[PDB]
Subunit: 286 residues, 6 copies
């Protein structure tokens, strides 16, 4: 009656970003995963819906301060509803997502979600206090979020997997695959400007030599809550001349080698070749 | 450890406001309620700890961007960690609280209890951002959805762990009615104390009283500035005091005390237990 | 001597906007009106001059805070002289205009001008406190300003009308015509973005259904003293999909029917067909 | 009614500052002036009411964007209604005042009287915005155009309604000379009181005294910041006090009192009426 | 060891702007001057290096607050290191420059540099307190900076001049030439937008008539620490219609006449025609 | 004159802070040092004047953009002349100071002495802007490069003009060691006084003590805001006082006094001159 109006208020900021183009690597991963596990279409639908809400809510919490517009006539959610409403809808949406998950123990599910916020905590902490994460810390952070969200999807699918697949023989390789895939996806994605960092930027800072100019723009942007368009150009130009993108390409090639090995290992564990998964891996390049 | 370090980062904004001195009404209500239910001290402790986390996280989530200090050597949590870390920690803390609830237990019922709090806050944030002053009825409905609901959650948890010699089914209806009305009484009183985000006096003066141009305009000035300074606040106060709208609040509270005293009596009779603790709590919530 | 310098200071902000292109619908209306009344060219000149000063001064008072530039190298008057000088010149110019009018009773003339500020008061009041005017209030506001300024011109012309036209038989229809024409002109003009409002925007809010997104951008722009370019795009897109411009077109078609009736009624009262007035009405379309 | 509501909106910013306590000099001057002219109490009331509206509207028009509160529970009109509503109401109020003037009456002469006020304000706003410090002569010419002119308007209105047994033509010249000089005396005094927008002391120190680098630069700092804070103001004050430029103000005021006392005497002789009220007013305008 | 790192910090903001394109009129002047004096290539190199450091450091002190980017991906030095580091590096660089100069008396060298700051003082003073310099004051300011920097180069070269040139017979004409050349270069350069001023703008203000609009934008920009793009357009448009660029062209033509006379006088003092110097003069036109 | 006017413009920001009351330690150290070297009063006067110009110019160069007033009627130099004029005057004043140094004299040695000050300031500005908290060792190296160096410059100048009966070569090594250690002692003390840009206590608590999350985050908050307000400062202070890191400062200063008293004694023996002035100065630099 009047409660439908209240719900419409509560979910208005969510419905806003939920209409944006997703560029669904995650759903393509779940589809590829299900070519092995063969979970009923009805179930993977709910699992997709669950992790999407989880992913969308992550974005709302991430971009609740963002002022830059999303599309042509679509401002940031913050520029429609303000920070407070955005944050409140986001927190509610996560809890609703967890409630939806509880249909497919309790403490285990809660812990899996909470790891995501452990990851975000480190990312936020480092950003706010001006720490450039080492490559090792960068990876651990990715594992606790982008990799973790991927892991949640994998676990839910394994739980609802067809009765003719051996879950215990496969759970091992499946999560090693998931962790490496999320890392590969995140590294690839952070590369597609040149997240807040990149493998190139991180390596350049920590590897060798003085780039006083670079240290100082980052501090400048940090003081201003981000860098301008010119400053970003400047940082890209430094990275391009130091040949630091070549390091990223080296790591990714090795990452594909590790991942192609994991897939074949699983393809042999089951009697199922997975071109879809190998296809997805091949499209996460350079 | 290095995961202990990661935990310390995550909990750091929570540990900050958690050291602030609390109001005390919530724990006092639980103690007064337990004089009936006689829940084991260990269990009420966990229940107290759980709703406190739930309460502190609520504070963090709506104070994540105000700039006024809490005490002299205590800036706002926002002015220590920033909005992002504050909001992230807060959201984590709520999930951690829900995990703690289940630990001493239905799953969907627990979730629905928590989510009501955000439906109530959604309306609060909606009205504020779009310059709508709540009607007295909407103001109550919001209070029931939040402050009344958090009290309700505490009540539900106590009932489930009540000593096996009290009749939970005979007492359940009366107990939740008492809880809702007391949360309202607590909130109205609290908003009143803070007057001299809304107030029953301010609500009544806008809807059932005729055109005050300076009041409406100074509210819009504050609404589009994030908040009013002291002189604007004082100006709003001065208007309320000359129109004697504070008397309306006094009237509602007195009637609310009558309802509540009657509700306590019914429960003091259903059980064979007089509750001077609950009645004292009621009396201290004066306007 | 030195007083010429002082006057040049006082009227500098006025001379600034007075050189802008007017897009004179008002003067075309006065010309069309004079095809009936046949007021001496010298007199309509002074009347045109009077209402223009009145209109220009209205703009100065309206845009004394505006930061957006007018033309290519022409910033807002505020960005040349500041708010204080702009406001002071504006108020002076209105009083001078009234003095000029007093050549063509006193309390009646003063009252006619004061109605304009009654209209602006409601517009400013609603804008500042976040009230979206109903269609009825929107009309009453238009009648008290854009329609009122038009009415002032009509009255002045009627007063100086040729001796062979019956003022008493015509005054009735003439002011009904003027009120409807100003309304039609304002509705048409507010449409030419998609004033601060529009008939479409007003109707959409008040007619039917929840557009949470729409309510919230308006509140956001209100807090910021106007919306950005993206937010305006967003509002247009919502109105375009809700087919709300179709309501405006419906009202305008009806408005032209009422107005064509008024013109013919006057064309028959006198023995004078007025193609110029009908031409003007036909160009205020969609 | 619904037009009464519209009126209330329009007059709301005016009703706000109209409740502030006034200086009182203007009404006192009119009373002292009426001890000569013996205008019917009803008429001087309307004249007082008219120039007050004219005065209040002037305040609104140049205080439409300063952010400092007037009293403790009284923020600036700007900080209640905003600039737009303040400016719109003010402009309306001036026109309403002019309409009131005609009501108890030439048309063009009345308009010209009002428009002088804006010519004077134009120069004030011009010099301020472009960082020009007025010469003492320009400072007087501005005062005559505004504060002196408003007093002049009051004088003209009183004269026109004067008791039929006083010779208006014999007294007119002396009366306007007195009015101009008293407006100047009132303004110089007032600016002096506010020192310890300009001041006679500050004007004199810049033009007839040699190079003070810190003073000029701190003025430019304030001019491009909208205004100086207290320490900058205090700094400006400290410079004026050590250069003893305040003594120059004292000198001008003493000479002004001599001129004014002589002017009152001439009028006290043209009429057979000593005016202790006007002389008391003069004496109270001390530096 | 660690001191190399400290030096790299200290000189990081200097190395930043030192890589920018110079558009070296100054070096072309020194080359032209050396066609007479014939100072050893090694020495003019150090002299060029000295005045460049001096010039670069001048820029750092001038633009330590500037927010506008220099090139495509090169923000202002202020937007990399902040004002404090920029100012500190600048002051250090001047002192190092003076130390470098001391290889080619002491009080005379110090005084020559200090004149530069006397010039900047007047420029900064006038800008901050809203004084438009007269043409005479404009010239004296130029002589104390742009002309003075040119004079420093001339003096250093004269000191190291070949033994077969008469320094005493030439010092007179050489410094008159230098002063006039710097003035001509600065006037030409200030013209290449339409420094903070121009000969046209200065003349227009001081020559004749009221341009209220012009006075008020300048005050507006002054309050805002500079004018926007539109305001600058507006100022150019006023100058272009008042035919004030014609005054600049008049002064420059006369300046070339004076300068061509000085060059020939020197060409006859020595037995050396200097096409390079005359070439440089010819390229400082309009 | 019209060049005297130009000079007045140039020196105006310098003349402003030059009238502020000085700390006095620098001149007191020179006087105590001259009790050994017996430099003619005329010469030490010029040396004092020179290092003062050098010191005042340093203040101007790093206070050219802070907005807090110095006294009640004394705003920051920045808030009188702006950053540009302040920075320009400061840079000129340093060059003028160097010219004064040469006047009462090597050229390259004098320049190198001055340039060390900017190498030290470069590190200070670098660490601050990029959020690096100096290690105790780096903190000392910076102090030696600046405050210690300015003292060193004064020492070198005194030595060169010392009375011909004191052995400069026998005393040079001990004198510079004393100078460096005293500059450090003066700076540590001064930073300590300002606690209750860095401080030895704050430095020690971050590096040799374990994870304080609120401290690090509030520093970053201030670092990206240009500076902390009073409550943030007070909050930082409250943390230092409960961790008793102030005791570490006390320990270093006591050990520093032991070293310095030993150094004075060696010089009191190399010369036949006890220096109660230098020892008193040492003792007054207490923590």
């Amino acid at each position: 009656d009047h409660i439908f109006f209240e719900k419409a208020v509560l979910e208005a900021p969510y419905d806003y970003i939920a209409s944006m183009p997703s560029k669904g690597v995650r759903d393509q991963f779940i589809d590829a995963l299900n070519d092995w596990l063969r979970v009923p279409d009805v179930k993977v639908g709910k699992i997709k819906d669950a992790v999407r809400v989880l992913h969308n809510s992550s974005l709302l919490l991430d971009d609740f301060q963002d002022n830059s517009p999303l599309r042509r006539g679509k401002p940031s959610t913050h520029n429609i509803f303000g920070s407070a409403q955005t944050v409140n809808t986001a927190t509610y949406s996560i809890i609703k997502a967890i409630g939806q998950i509880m249909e497919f123990s309790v403490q285990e599910v809660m812990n899996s979600i909470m790891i995501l916020f452990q990851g975000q905590a480190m990312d936020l902490f480092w950003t706010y206090n001006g720490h450039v994460p080492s490559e090792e810390e960068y990876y651990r952070m990715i594992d606790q979020k982008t990799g973790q969200l991927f892991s949640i999807a994998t676990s839910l699918l394994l739980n609802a997997a067809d009765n003719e697949i051996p879950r215990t023989k496969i759970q091992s390789c499946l999560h090693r695959l998931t962790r490496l895939l999320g890392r590969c996806f995140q590294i690839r994605d952070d590369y597609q400007n040149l997240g807040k960092w990149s493998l190139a930027l991180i390596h350049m800072i920590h590897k060798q030599r003085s780039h006083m100019a670079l240290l100082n723009v980052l501090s400048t942007g940090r003081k201003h809550g981000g860098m301008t368009l010119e400053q970003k150009q400047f940082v890209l130009d430094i990275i391009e001349e130091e040949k630091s993108l070549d390091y990223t390409r080296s790591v990714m090639m090795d990452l594909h080698v590790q991942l192609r090995a994991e897939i074949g290992r699983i393809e042999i564990l089951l009697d199922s070749p997975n071109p879809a998964m190998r296809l997805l891996l091949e499209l996460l390049r350079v």
